[model samples]
Target: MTKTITVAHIQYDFKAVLEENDENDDEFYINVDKNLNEIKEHKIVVLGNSRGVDAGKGNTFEKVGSHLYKARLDGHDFLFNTIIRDGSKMLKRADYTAVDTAKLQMRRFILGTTEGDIKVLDSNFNLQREIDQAHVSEITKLKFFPSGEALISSSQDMQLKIWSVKDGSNPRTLIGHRATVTDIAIIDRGRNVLSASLDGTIRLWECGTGTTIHTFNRKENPHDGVNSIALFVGTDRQLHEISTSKKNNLEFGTYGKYVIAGHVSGVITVHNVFSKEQTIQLPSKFTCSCNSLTVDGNNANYIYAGYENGMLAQWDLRSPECPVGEFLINEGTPINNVYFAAGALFVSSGFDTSIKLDIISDPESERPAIEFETPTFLVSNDDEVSQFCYVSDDESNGEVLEVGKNNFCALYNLSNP
Candidate 1:
């Protein structure tokens, strides 16, 4: 019959506080699921130091001994038994801070991979242009500007170079960063870009002058580097719904922010663009390193993150504490790329199978029916295949393009479904 006590706001059973309640209760803990995704709830507790325990409704606790604190349940009455701990739960204070919270057309695509080559081709595997020496080392990714007139690519050579989409000639380069620039995001307009690197840093670079506009790194940023990053923007209906509930005062929806980075540490970080505050973090699962975190075009409330352990996991901003659960896209194989098409279409590119799947919601069954489709193969042995992009001009035809690590750039077409 152990009586519960709130030591420095942390709920602890009598003896367990001395040992551990799976965790050091004295440490500040945000209410989290087992996987540790920060969720709804402001309730927090901490273990404090001997100088003073700043907990409860002001410092109302009475100290009788070196390691004992007394609590008076009454407003101003006589004494009760003082709650004292021989082994103080008060050790170190924890800081609690203020909180705020694609359809594809498979044609006319661009692809680039390791060999510093770039190719723009149609769905029929016929090329419009080719630049065999776009970069010096392995190309990490390829992208076309929103206008589709300019192209951008990052490589293992630590450069993000831009080229002409029509003839592949400008050959302008954006340079900075010591490690491999794993990924980059085109922000707002084509003038500025966000690049994440294996150097554990993110940089905002101006394309015209190739200058670092700003650098972002949190004090809590782990030593591990960033593997992939995506732009998270757009109005979210989920946050709108919460703020509009009958008796709600907390505001949201302005939080359709930018920059969702999947670090090599497997911890996903979401930062506010304007305030530049590192606001939310998603926990690492198992021992897998994050490969990619793909956001849908519709909104920022949900995303698919693939890991090196072959687990394709999705965490919904709506119910982040409990992720949609992990599914092995391919057992024992790392998912090279996880692409999100419009609606519920998802593509997981791994060896032997780079599949397109749609999770169709069934009204009666409640469970989604996964229907399969096919794309031109993006097979690569040395993880040389770049991430795939899908675009559709009209319902009649769709275009899907993927980059390859080998010297040759491959193209594929999708049949109308």
Candidate 2:
């Protein structure tokens, strides 16, 4: 009996160990079976941070169950278990695994988890190289060059660093912003870089020389503790400009064709870099900040988003009114990040300690395959179908829970056709 399958997730509850004074938020995992006609779900495993206040503890756990986010597609039929320990900081090189699965080759770099370290990764999620690192703490934002040879990174330490991996050494750091540099973006022309700060201003920086370009200082758009910033509009209808005053963050592709940005108020904005025009804006308010958003390389019209509250939203430019699709991920925990890769598939990470994938497929033409569908103008194709899987900690109770506080990745098989 051949059955259609997609990934789905649920949430779990764990007792607070130490950070009760902070947020009683942690994460788990789940497993779901898409039976073509209907979706069947069950708890897979859970990961937990039970070793409270232990710094040396292994920052990993595993579970096969379902939690916060949805599943993804395995188009290449290749599964690589990637684990990001708590201190690794998510830099492309630093402490990340750069397995060149193509040639079974790996390139190493210095510490990556420090704040504000920017990196570039290849299509298979391999670290291409360290673009730049000039932050005092963790690097918060990273943007790659069109040719993927150069990158730009910004950090809370009030600095923007630009580097070309081809050169490797003699990197350039631009120091001008007085306050924490909250966000940064490269203009479509590749000649200028835009940055926002907690100081309430968006300054343009030169890419080659790392010099000042321009600064936007209007009263209405003052960078007010800007939580995040982006340059694109999804479907919300707001002008997705370089509003560096808010937490909404901005990004650009190497080719400079499109710019995208998201904010803490649950809004996503877009811009056409080449045309130098603002596009669409949409609201994506979840419990936490709407910190992560991505565009599919294969289809520029479709964008994916992940929120701090574990909500994932997709936007279709064709329908500039609402997100084409959305689903609740780890509803119990907060979602911290998200991205799109391998074309139509999406990947997400968050405080829930699990990653999620969502594959879009063409629903039956006669009826809606899902209770919800994409926004206006979104065309669904069966070829975009995908498999979804998540990993968490679960050696003891792996079969019953959805996610755990440990490190592990789950793999699922999905096909759109």
Candidate 3:
């Protein structure tokens, strides 16, 4: 009997096909059975002399359990697990960054954790290199360059530093923020970098010389203490017309010509970086501090924001009155971060113990597809989730890396059978 199985990487849609097996190759049958991976898990249909059930005819694989499945064709089986292979010793808490370095031609993991600890892991998740004291304080974020040869890191010590990924050596420091650096973004094809700070300003710096190019709010930039910022280049005019005078704490991102930002006052600001016009501001129905921002797909047509009030809001750039739709992640826990991957939305809460996965269907009809709990052994009950991200150069095989306070970190993968 010849058979084939196509594994699903996105949207949880899988397929299986069975080829003809009779001597004349005239008969074919399709069967589905549970427990096909182990003893007693077999259910076969013996419809004889049926040519219609050829390999071209495929059967859909069902999710029998969390990351587990079965197939009915003899010698054809299915297995699914979210936990990838094991790696280095588990961390108490840490933030992870995966790099697919062109120079090395291999994927690697970089983890920054409490007390400024930064370590590099090989593709197999084994420790390759480490710096015991990369910073004087806790590491807040780790970002690799487009080339993946270097990484830019932010710390609670109020400094942004660039380090060589090959050797844990600090090559240059971009120091200007009076308060802790909140987030950093690469701009102008890595020629420059943008950093947000609690000191109520966003600064653009020359990546090579490590000098300030310009400061967004040193005089009139948005205030209320900027917490985070995202950067995207845009050229659209509709996004350039809406105007706002009040600037609250904000997180920003750029898509095409539109620069989108989420504010502390539950407001979203869309600006055309080229137009230099007043940004269009959309207010949320309820008051909440926006903690994270990410755009949907490529158009920047829809912007998603996570809030400190455990609320997730999506807005259509055209109409900004009420959120196009909103979702409550965890009862009272603030959503620390939200990201899109493999056609689903992944959300993590600061104080909650679970990471949520929601299929991005119609906004009005979306619900939780899976609510995965953070590993108790990796994170303490008192520690809150700091952030989590989907890491993979290829979505065909991906993993979710999570970090929490007190140096907690866990890695999960979608494994095939």
**Per-residue lDDT of model 3, residues 1-417, tens digit only:** 011111111112221222333334332222221222222322233223533322332533344444444332343433333333334354334544322222246777677776787777666666777877788887777777877778888888889888887778898998878987777777544666677776766676776688775566422346644555655555443333365432212212222434455556656565543343436677755577777777665445566677887777767666777666665643355777766555445555545334334344544544322222111111223345566556655435666666555444556553333
Q: Backbone clashes in each candidate structure, one number apiece?
A: 12, 85, 15
lDDT of each: 0.54, 0.42, 0.54
Task: Report the C-alpha displacement of residue 322, candidate 3, in angstroms.
Answer: 2.4
Stronger candidate by TM-score (2 vs 3): 3
Worst 10 residues of 1 by lDDT: 94-103
Question: What would the per-residue lDDT of candidate 1 be over residues 341-383, giving only the tens digit for each residue?
Answer: 6454444444433544455554774444333221122222222
Best by lDDT: 3
Model 3 vs. true fold: TM:
0.66
RMSD (Cα, Å) of model 2: 14.7
Sort every candidate by TM-score, greatest first.
3, 1, 2
Q: Model 3 segments beyond 4 Å from truth? A: 1-82, 85-104, 217-221, 233-258, 274-278, 359-384, 393-395, 405-407, 414-417
Please identify which of the two predictions, 1 or 3, would achieve the higher TM-score against the true structure: 3
List TM-score per model, in order. 0.61, 0.51, 0.66
Of the two candidates 1 and 2, the one with more favorable TM-score, higher being better, is 1
